Each structure stands twice: as structure tokens, then as C-alpha cells.
Amino acid sequence: PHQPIPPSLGEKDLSDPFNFLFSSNKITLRKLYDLTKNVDFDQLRQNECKKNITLSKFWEPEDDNWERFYSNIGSCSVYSDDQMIDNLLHDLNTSPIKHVHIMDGTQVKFVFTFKNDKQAVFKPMRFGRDYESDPNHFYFSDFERHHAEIATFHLDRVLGFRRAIPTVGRVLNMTTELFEKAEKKLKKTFFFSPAKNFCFVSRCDYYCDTTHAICGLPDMKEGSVQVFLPDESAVPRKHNRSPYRRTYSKKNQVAEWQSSMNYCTDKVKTKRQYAHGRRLLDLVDIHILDYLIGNQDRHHFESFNVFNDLPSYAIHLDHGRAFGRSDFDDDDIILPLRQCCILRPSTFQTLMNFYSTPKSLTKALHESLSKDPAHPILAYKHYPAMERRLAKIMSHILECFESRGVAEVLVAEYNNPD
Ligand SMILES: *[C@@H]1O[C@H](CO)[C@@H](O[C@@H]2O[C@H](CO)[C@@H](O[C@@H]3O[C@H](CO)[C@@H](O)[C@H](O)[C@@H]3O)[C@H](O)[C@H]2NC(C)=O)[C@H](O)[C@H]1NC(C)=O
Ligand SMILES: *[C@@H]1O[C@H](CO)[C@@H](O[C@@H]2O[C@H](CO)[C@@H](O)[C@H](O)[C@H]2NC(C)=O)[C@H](O)[C@H]1NC(C)=O
Ligand code: NI
């Protein structure tokens, strides 16, 4: 089947997810050690977050973990309590579904309304875990992968960012939980395939048609379930165009930042929004994440606009187009690191910690992913890829240290003299 069963409902893979050879370059490792042996990271880290305040203390409800999640949304992090979040994850997976609606407007996605009247974003599973993106497909031609949404959220926690939105796997009964709970406009788009599998077309801009319908085998369908952001009326949000937006054209495929090396220096560091603050450090952080997962589709940034005065941060969202290729690293994604050569001190330590112990990153990720009910989330072939990409990142960092000095790269806040 092109659209297979949920892997959790299949034969359990007994293979060792880490039976691959890697090893770490000790020359590079030693050069990073030497260039940083006198850096007091502890004192450096304390300025990365100006004021650590949650949404509740700023307001001065916890009936359910949604409200408990919303309340603990901080000024320098989306969440800081893994256990409470893991409880929310459990709720997203197990809570009874009351309504299913087609979401605004993009690829097929549903809004789940649970019995507690809380809500979530649902993205259905299409292909199996082994499926890789067409080499001829552009980033804007790529089909979303629900398991990429899940995997990246976990990786975002493992890296210690916690600026991603809680997402869990869930195997749904298409008949009782989708069809019978669906709105009238969505319900009518359901049908049976020639193989008698249950299918829905839905309505959306990107290939919500009969040919690309989502189909069960016959009536179950795994998907990603992501907790809704708090209401915009209460917690307003900002939508910002990325300076590293790609061209999104097959004729002119080369943006300025892809051909001009000094792009960051002349065109990004000199902008008001990036000249002072945390925004550029965020951009480097999020592109490190996107490079590790091979996400090319980072055209805009999303941020809360609710904490007065204090600086906002980019919400790590929209990861559907991640993990498309296990045999290809797109170094264009990590270009901001190479061009800007600034890096949040905590991020460096996190990366350094994982890098100095081979396979520790993917092992810590595997362990996190294992708690998801829909595991395995990622095909194991992506693990050596992530290790390979991590090593390459450290090489770019070493180049930044040697070219611009460690005191100019590792800053908790960026300030442009000019
Ligand atoms: C900003 O301030 C908040 C306010 O406390 C910080 O949150 C606390 O961070 C610690 C350290 O990660 C959390 O501790 C952990 O709790 C789990 C669950 O019990 C435990 O297994 C771990 O061993 C660890 O003790 C703590 O839960 C968390 N508090 C809350 C209410 O979430 C936050 O770390 C500060 N920094 C940032 C960037 O937000
Ligand atoms: C999904 O839920 C449906 C319930 O609607 C399950 O199908 C039912 O199976 C029983 C078994 O005897 C029948 O009596 C019902 O008539 C069936 N329902 C319908 C609407 O035909 C189905 O088995 C469930 N599938 C999974 C994978 O859980
Ligand atoms: Ni097609």
C-alpha cells in the first residue's frame, strides 16, 4: 500500500537503531576546546533571557492541561515543565473527540474539538516512515509528513529550546472519531476506494483531491495531534517575513543570500529588527534546528506578542516538511550560521555536549520519541544523518570562532556597533 498502516500496528522492528558507525573528529573537537577553555559560560548564559516570566504572573484557570499549558507560556520559552507537557500529550492522544472541522484554509489538516471544548490541530498520515522526498521536488512541492511534526517537537526539547508546540501521535478510528464527528462540508468528501479502504478528500489548496485522498487500511488512520495556540484575542501573535526566505520559483532558484556571502553583514545585521536583541540569535537557533531536520520551508516566523516591553521569540512551528531526505544535507539551511557567525552560548554548549559524545543526540531523541504512542516516529536511517549534520555544524562554528573570534560569536545578546 502507498498509504500504509500505522507502524505501531505493524510488526515491531527488533533492529538496533544505532548499529551505525560514526566517530568524532578529534582535531576539530580539540580546536573548539582550546578556543573556549577560558569562557565562563555560566555567567554568559544568565543574559540570554532578560526577564523570565510566565503568562499567568504577567496577567496578575488550570482546569485542564491545555489551560495549564497556556498559563506557563514564558517570555523566553513556550514551556518549562516536561511532566506537565507529557500530561498534555497524553490528553491529546486519549481525549474523546467531539467535533472535526476543516482548518484554515495549505495542505489537509483538521481542527479537533475535544469533550473539554479544548482544541488541537490534526494532520493525517500519508506515506510510510521509509518514504523519502522526490529529488526533483522543490520545498514547495513537498507533501507534509505528520511524523515530522512530532519528531521535531521532541528534538526541540532535547536541544533544550522548548519553543516548539506540543505534538503527539494518535491512531484514529476514521468511522467513529473522524467521519461521524465531522462537519457537514467535510463529511461529504468521504468515500470508499476500489480496495474498500475508507478515504476522505476534504478541502484545501494543495491537492485535496480524489487522486491524493487520505485512505485507511481500511478504517484506521494515524496522524499528528498538536495543541492549539491560545486564542489570538487573549494572546496576540506576530507574523514576520524571514530575511532568509527562499525564492519559491523554479526559474530563478537562487535568492541573494544563497549567492552573496556577506548577505548577513550587509542586509540582515544592519536592519533595525536584527541590529539589537535576540531575533538574530533566534534565527540562528531555528536554522540549526531546520538544518538538523532538513527543513527548507522556513519562509516566515511566528511569535507571541503579549509580553509588554520584553523581547519576543520565534515559535518553532510548521515542521511538516522536515525529515524528507536521509541521504542529503542542505547546507543552504545552515547558511545563517556561516554568514552571521553569532551563536547563543547555551546553544553552543548543547551542541558541544552532544557532539563531544557521538550518537548521544539521536539516542536522547530516540528515547524521547519512544514515549509517543505512535512510535517509531522516524525511520532509523535519519539518525546517522542527524549525527552527520551535527558534525558539519560544529565545523561551521569552528570557522566562525577562528575568523571572528570567540568573544564575537558567543553572545547572549547581539548589538551592532554600526
Ligand atoms: C524560567 O523560569 C521558570 C520558572 O521556574 C523555569 O522553570 C523550571 O525549570 C526547571 C529546570 O528545567 C524545571 O525542573 C524540572 O522539573 C522536572 C519535572 O519535575 C524534573 O524531572 C527535572 O529534574 C527538573 O527538576 C521546573 O519544572 C521548571 N518549572 C516550571 C514551573 O516549569 C525555567 O527553567 C526558566 N528558564 C526558561 C528558559 O524558561
Ligand atoms: C472503528 O469503529 C467502528 C465502529 O463504527 C468499528 O466497526 C464496527 O465493527 C462491529 C463489529 O461487529 C460492527 O458490529 C459494527 O457495525 C461496525 N461499525 C460500522 C460503522 O460498520 C471498526 O471495527 C473500528 N475500527 C478500528 C480499527 O478500531
Ligand atoms: Ni501526485
DSSP notation for 248-275:
--SSS---HHHH-TTHIIIIITTSHHHH
**Residue 53 near residue 307, CB atoms below 8 Å:** yes
Is the minimum distance from the CB of 71 to ligand 1 under 6 angstroms? no
Beta strands 190-192 and 198-200 are antiparallel
Cα 78 to Cα 328: distance, rounded to the nearest angstrom:
31
Nearest CA to ligand 2 atom 9: 175
**Residue 157 near residue 77, CB atoms below 8 Å:** no
Residues ≥6 apart with Cβ < 8 Å to 373: 8, 93, 168, 169, 170, 171
Cα 371 to Cα 158: distance, rounded to the nearest angstrom:
13
> Which residues make beta-bridge pairs with 97?
114
Q: Determination technique for this PDB entry?
A: X-ray
Residues ≥6 apart with Cβ < 8 Å to 40: none
For residue 284, the Cα-to-chain-centroid distance in whole angstroms is 14
**Residue 266 near residue 257, CB atoms below 8 Å:** no
Nearest to 91, CA basis, from 63, 110, 71, 53: 63
Nearest CA to ligand 2 atom 27: 220
Q: How many CA atoms lie within 13 A of 371 on its CB side?
A: 15
Cα 2 to Cα 136: distance, rounded to the nearest angstrom:
19
> Which residues make beta-bridge pairs with 303?
238, 314
Nearest to 200, CA basis, from 108, 98, 107: 108
Q: What b/e readout covers 14-53, taking b as 16+ CB neighbours within 10 angstroms?
A: eeebeeeeeebeeeebebbeebbeeeeeeebeeebbeeee
Let me know if 297 is a catalytic residue.
yes
Residues ≥6 apart with Cβ < 8 Å to 309: none
Q: Classify 214 as helix, strand or coil.
A: strand
Is the minimum distance from the CB of 73 to ligand 1 under 6 angstroms? no
Nearest CA to ligand 2 atom 24: 173
**Residue 174 near residue 220, CB atoms below 8 Å:** yes
Cα 342 to Cα 400: distance, rounded to the nearest angstrom:
8
Residues 366/368/371/373 CA torsion (nearest 10 deg): -70
Mutation probe of ligand 2 site: the residue of 219, 220, 221, 222 with most atoms within 8 A of C-beta? 219
Is the minimum distance from the CB of 56 to ligand 1 under 6 angstroms? no
Q: What is the DSSP string of 42-85?
A: HHHHTTSSS---BHHHHH---SSHHHHHHHT-BSS-S---HHHH
Beta strands 314-315 and 300-304 are antiparallel
Burial of 309 (0-12, 13-18, 19+ CB in 10 A): exposed
Residues in the chain whose C lies over 2.5 Å from the next residue's N (breaks after): 60, 105
Cα 114 to Cα 108: distance, rounded to the nearest angstrom:
19
Is the minimum distance from the CB of 28 to ligand 1 under 6 angstroms? no
Residues ≥6 apart with Cβ < 8 Å to 69: 79, 84, 85, 88, 166, 227
Cα 10 to Cα 310: distance, rounded to the nearest angstrom:
49
DSSP state of 221: E
Quickly list H helices, 77-219.
82-94, 146-158, 184-187
Residues contributing to the annotated binding site for ATP: 107, 123, 144, 226-229, 302, 318
What count of other Cβ atoms lies within 10 Å of the Cβ of residue 172?
24
Cell triple for residue 201?
478528500
Q: Indicate the residue type of 62.
A: E
Is the minimum distance from the CB of 52 to ligand 1 under 6 angstroms? yes
Looking up cell 500504509, which residue turns up? 4
Residues contributing to the annotated binding site for Mn(2+): 144, 318
Given phi > 0 = left and psi -120 to 50 = alpha, else beta, which region is 309?
left
**Residue 87 near residue 66, CB atoms below 8 Å:** no
How many residues are given for the chain? 418
Task: Please tell me the distance between residue 130's alpha carbon and the centre of ligand 3 in angstroms.
Answer: 18
Q: Indicate the residue type of 76.
A: C
**Closest atom, ligand 1, to C-alpha of 74:** 39
Sheet of 110-114, strand order: 97-102, 110-114, 119-124, 220-227, 167-173
Is the minimum distance from the CB of 46 to ligand 1 under 6 angstroms? no
Residues ≥6 apart with Cβ < 8 Å to 57: none
Nearest CA to ligand 1 atom 10: 80
Cα angle 202, 206, 210; round to 5: 50
Cα 291 to Cα 332: distance, rounded to the nearest angstrom:
8
Cell triple for residue 151?
519528531
Q: What b/e readout covers 72-105, taking b as 16+ CB neighbours within 10 angstroms?
A: bbbbbbbbeeeebbeebbebbeebebeebbbbee
Looking up cell 495549505, which residue turns up? 106
Structure's resolution in angstroms: 2.6
Cell triple for residue 63?
482546569
Options 142, 282, 297, 372, the catalytic residue: 297
Is the minimum distance from the CB of 217 to ligand 2 under 6 angstroms? no
Nearest CA to ligand 2 atom 18: 175
